[PDB]
Design a protein. Structure first.
Length: 181
């Protein structure tokens, strides 16, 4: 049966796109692209869309578990936060696309062991002043889960142990770091 069945993923995922249009509210600029729940359907989608480095400034991609919208207000994000990766203008070229794909694989591959259930999704923001990639988790007070996801993520990204990344709550963002690894 390994011959003809697609490989189902642990979760079904939704990809979202955001395009900055000052005519519209922020929520109105957020749009679901499509969903998938197999490895094959993931790659069909990835191979079909623009690399993040080719997006116009002001655009975002978001990959979230089906039923979680990529906004702070979702029940699964209101008490959560994000591990934040900040990219200077030069890293748009060097690391943006490879960091984002690694992040996508950390999500769909459930790479954070027992704490993968705390993952909600990830977001890449393409911006003229500097890009951002982040993994969103559901509960910023679960120190074990947050710091563990943060350590795994930093290692999968290949970041030097010289560098530090930080985790901030969405509540703080909507109005500093809570954890660092």
């Amino acid at each position: 049966p390994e011959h003809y069945i697609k490989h189902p993923l642990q979760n079904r995922w939704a990809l979202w796109f955001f395009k900055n249009d000052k005519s519209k509210t922020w929520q109105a600029n957020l749009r679901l692209i499509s969903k998938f729940d197999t490895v094959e359907d993931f790659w069909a989608l990835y191979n079909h869309i623009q690399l993040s480095s080719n997006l116009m400034p002001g655009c975002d991609y978001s990959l979230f578990k089906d039923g979680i919208e990529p906004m702070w207000e979702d029940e699964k994000n209101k008490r959560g936060g994000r591990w934040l990766i900040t990219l200077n203008k030069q890293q748009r070229r060097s690391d943006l696309d490879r960091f984002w794909l690694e992040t996508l694989l950390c999500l769909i591959g459930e790479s954070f062991d027992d704490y993968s259930d705390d993952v909600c999704g990830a977001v890449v923001n393409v911006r003229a002043k500097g890009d951002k990639i982040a993994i969103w988790t559901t509960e910023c007070e679960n120190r074990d889960a947050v710091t563990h996801i943060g350590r795994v993520y930093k290692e999968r990204l290949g970041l030097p142990p010289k560098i530090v990344i930080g985790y901030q709550s969405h509540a703080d963002t909507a109005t500093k770091n809570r954890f660092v690894v």
